[PDB]
Amino acid sequence: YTPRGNSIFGLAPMLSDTDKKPFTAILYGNGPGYKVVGGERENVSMVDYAHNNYQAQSAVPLRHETHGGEDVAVFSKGPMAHLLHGVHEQNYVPHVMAYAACIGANLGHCAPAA
Amino acid sequence: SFKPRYKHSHFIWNRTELLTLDPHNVDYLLGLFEPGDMQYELNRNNVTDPSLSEMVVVAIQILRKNPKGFFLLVEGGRIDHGHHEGKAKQALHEAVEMDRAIGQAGSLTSSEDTLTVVTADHSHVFTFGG
Ligand SMILES: *[C@@H]1O[C@H](CO)[C@@H](O[C@@H]2O[C@H](CO)[C@@H](O)[C@H](O)[C@H]2NC(C)=O)[C@H](O)[C@H]1NC(C)=O
Ligand SMILES: *[C@@H]1O[C@H](CO)[C@@H](O[C@@H]2O[C@H](CO)[C@@H](O)[C@H](O)[C@H]2NC(C)=O)[C@H](O)[C@H]1NC(C)=O
Ligand SMILES: *[C@@H]1O[C@H](CO)[C@@H](O)[C@H](O)[C@H]1NC(C)=O
Ligand SMILES: [Ca+2]
Ligand SMILES: [Zn+2]
């Protein structure tokens, strides 16, 4: 619930209401930023959290943070870009691109019909 | 299929289609007049099959459109067949027919901007004399 304009690498406005320590707006699900000094999670006001290499805190420790299964956006401009619409499967994308450039299996865009 | 979006392609297969054509309306032409080699000029079906000269004319009539100019390859290829078979009268009639076609090419273009070149790939062991 950060205030408008808050730096993307900054802290959230008021502290945790559980352990009275602050937290960054950015947080990972898992990954190496999970840091627990003792049995407590790390008071971040000490360390340089807008540093280049600062690792935001996560829920689960891992060598490496993981991917996510959510969906992703497709941004499209140019000829036939509107064929890229709605929720689709990922393999749909090059089929549009091929169709519109008149390459691949379907050369329908370059048919003499209209 | 590989032709640009708003262009006219035909495919013709007989002599009637070849002279029906309007060369102001055909961007891509494909014409395959026999299953294999075409008929010797002295054997040709006046009706279903065009002479070499007929094909050269509407070929130039199409290719004259492009304002950058054109390149055209013409092969009187059945002279080789005629000599290979030993049948001089066919081989010599094929050569005369390509000559006719060379005469046509001269009236449809001008020597000011067209370089044309007549040659042969090789010869035969054809002689004449006594
Ligand atoms: C997290 O660390 C900060 C900074 O070390 C703590 O804030 C200071 O707290 C002490 C005493 O609690 C005060 O005397 C200081 O004035 C505070 N500010 C600074 C800039 O030092 C904070 O209390 C710590 N939180 C927890 C839960 O340990
Ligand atoms: C030359 O080719 C044309 C077209 O390929 C032939 O025209 C066909 O004529 C028949 C009737 O005899 C029609 O049913 C077909 O629909 C026509 N074809 C097309 C593609 O429209 C013509 O008969 C041929 N002529 C010779 C002498 O072979
Ligand atoms: C071709 O047409 C001429 C008409 O003058 C005819 O004499 C000749 O026999 C014909 N030959 C063939 C093979 O069609
Ligand atoms: Ca034929
Ligand atoms: Zn040969």
Swiss-Prot record, chain B:
Coiled coil: none annotated. It is found in: Cell membrane; Extracellular vesicle membrane; Mitochondrion membrane; Mitochondrion intermembrane space. Zn(2+) 2 binds at D80, H84. Ca(2+) binds at F33, E34, D49. Changing V125I: In HOPS; abolished alkaline phosphatase activity. Zn(2+) 1 binds at D121, H122. N-glycosylated. Changing L18P: In HPPC; severe allele. Changing E41K: In HPPI; does not affect alkaline phosphatase activity. Changing F70G: In HOPS; requires 2 nucleotide substitutions. Mg(2+) binds at E75. Changing D37A: In HOPS; reduced alkaline phosphatase toward diphosphate and pyridoxal 5'-phosphate. Changing P35T: In HOPS; 4% of wild-type activity. Changing D49A: Abolished alkaline phosphatase activity. It comes from the Eukaryota. Changing G77R: In HOPS; weak alkaline phosphatase activity. Changing G82R: In HOPS; loss of alkaline phosphatase activity. Glycans are attached at N14, N46. In most mammals there are four different isozymes: placental (ALPP), germ cell (ALPG), intestinal (ALPI) and tissue non-specific (liver/bone/kidney) (ALPL/TNAP). Belongs to the alkaline phosphatase family. Alkaline phosphatase that metabolizes various phosphate compounds and plays a key role in skeletal mineralization and adaptive thermogenesis. Has broad substrate specificity and can hydrolyze a considerable variety of compounds: however, only a few substrates, such as diphosphate (inorganic pyrophosphate; PPi), pyridoxal 5'-phosphate (PLP) and N-phosphocreatine are natural substrates. Homodimer. It is linked to Hypophosphatasia: A metabolic bone disease characterized by defective skeletal mineralization and biochemically by deficient activity of the tissue non-specific isoenzyme of alkaline phosphatase. Four forms are distinguished, depending on the age of onset: perinatal, infantile, childhood and adult type. The perinatal form is the most severe and is almost always fatal. The adult form is mild and characterized by recurrent fractures, osteomalacia, rickets, and loss of teeth. Calcium-binding is structural and does not influence the alkaline phosphatase activity. At very high concentrations, calcium can however substitute for zinc at zinc-binding sites, leading to strongly reduced enzyme activity. This is Alkaline phosphatase, tissue-nonspecific isozyme. It comes from Homo sapiens. The lineage of its organism: Eukaryota, Metazoa, Chordata, Craniata, Vertebrata. The gene is ALPL.
